[PDB]
Amino acid sequence: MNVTIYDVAREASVSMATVSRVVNGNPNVKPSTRKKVLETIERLGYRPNAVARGLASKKTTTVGVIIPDISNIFYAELARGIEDIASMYKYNIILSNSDQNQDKQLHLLNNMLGKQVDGIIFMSGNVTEEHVEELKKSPVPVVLAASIESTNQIPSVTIDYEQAAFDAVQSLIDSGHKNIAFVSGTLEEPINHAKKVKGYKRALTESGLPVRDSYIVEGDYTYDSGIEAVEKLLEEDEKPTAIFVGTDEMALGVIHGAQDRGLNVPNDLEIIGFDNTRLSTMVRPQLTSVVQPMYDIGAVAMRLLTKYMNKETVDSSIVELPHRIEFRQSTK
């Protein structure tokens, strides 16, 4: 603030352009004089001005993250991963919540973009055609996380939500279960009606089981939204022998819905969730869930992004980590 690169040029009897060379660290100075410069720095408390460096270097060492809601354990981990890999590449971060709505996103976007970010990790449950054609001309590199967008005109690390759903809904089938419903989140989120539902129905039809509109009910994403659906199933003639859920909490609120109706899990019904949240092992019975490595999805998207700003070699802009299933006390 008061001690500049100028005042080091003073106490160092060197040139302002010298002082810069030492801080940034570019080899090419007299070590004999170099240290002459590293002394004053420690001696004066000279903290370089990241801003002054920004205007002149045309780079900031900062990525901006647009994330739905940092208060949900789900996006939480995702955030850490991004934060970590970034803190590892000496890249600082700018975070904010998009509340999932559009006119707030494009805003955060265009904003950060003016803050001069050197990059952007962006994740939303809805990547409207608009945003794509918007991100596409961003002056700085972009990379999506946990997000789905059909064209693939933008680099993105994501997992195969369809297989995920499929490979789980099948688990049920191989266990004889021929009447398994699916408790889903907002059906409008393409990462549901275009990935999970199809992955769900792909498993039924593929093995020759029905596909009626009485096994796939909607509802919000929290605990409660799961207590409802359950009720709707027992109180119906297509007795659901088991259920697939696109969120752990939801499931957790379905396990309960049923025990309150006196039924026993799994003797009366096996239930498999989605995400494998630390919350998963928290329930009783223990919830078997579809693993979605969020910490990894975030770490990769950032790491990938750094491998763009620094202009390294990308071999694929469609990265997909794998998945599994953690069988527990909710299934045979």
């Binding site: 981990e77 850490r80 991963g81 590892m88 490595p293 910490y295 990894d296 770490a299 990938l304 980590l321």
Partner: protein, 84 residues
């Protein structure tokens, strides 16, 4: 070049931050380091790679180290993944 096949007594295995720590741990060595998994091997100082294998508990994997501190490296890495 020093080699070793190891289990991975880790509870989360080589995923989540543990994974991420493994990589930062790997970089404390000048020795090019690697990790083989059932056939595919990636750079162990690279987050991209290590995380693409998604190595969970119970899996045994070969780790490779070639450099001034290959023993030192290996000593630590295998050690870490050993949970023990």
């Amino acid at each position: 070049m020093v080699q070793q096949k190891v289990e991975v007594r880790l509870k989360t295995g080589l995923q989540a931050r543990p994974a991420a720590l493994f990589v930062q741990e790997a970089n404390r060595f000048t020795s090019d380091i690697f990790l083989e998994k059932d056939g595919k091997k990636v750079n162990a100082k690279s987050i991209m790679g290590l995380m693409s294998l998604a190595i969970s508990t119970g899996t045994e994997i070969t780790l490779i180290a070639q450099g001034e501190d290959e023993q030192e490296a290996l000593e630590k890495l295998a050690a870490y993944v050993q949970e023990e």
